[PDB]
Symmetry: C2
Subunit: 64 residues, 2 copies
Amino acid sequence: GPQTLVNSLEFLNIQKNSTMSEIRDIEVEVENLRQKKEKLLGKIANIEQNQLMLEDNLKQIDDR
Amino acid sequence: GPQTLVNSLEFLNIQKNSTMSEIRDIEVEVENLRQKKEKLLGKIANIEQNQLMLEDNLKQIDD
């Protein structure tokens, strides 16, 4: 009967909630990767800023 | 002195490049997860295209 099609709906619907939840898992990985990247850019920032407190000293001594 | 300073800048720079490398690595990983999410969002649509039809079919039946 037509209960078969209603059955297929609620199945598709189940599959959809499942697909959604996998999408949400993905959004989490992405966010957590996005932060790791931000930390890493902090490192660079500091490296560069440390480097320039050196390049300072070098070209100050480069005429002593 | 200038050697110490040159040795130091260079070392830091090794670190920099090697850090910019993990950054390129994350960026690839993130690209992949985006393409994965794009496909999954496609599939959400396929699911609903299908459901709509089944639902209309069930209405047609009501007549």
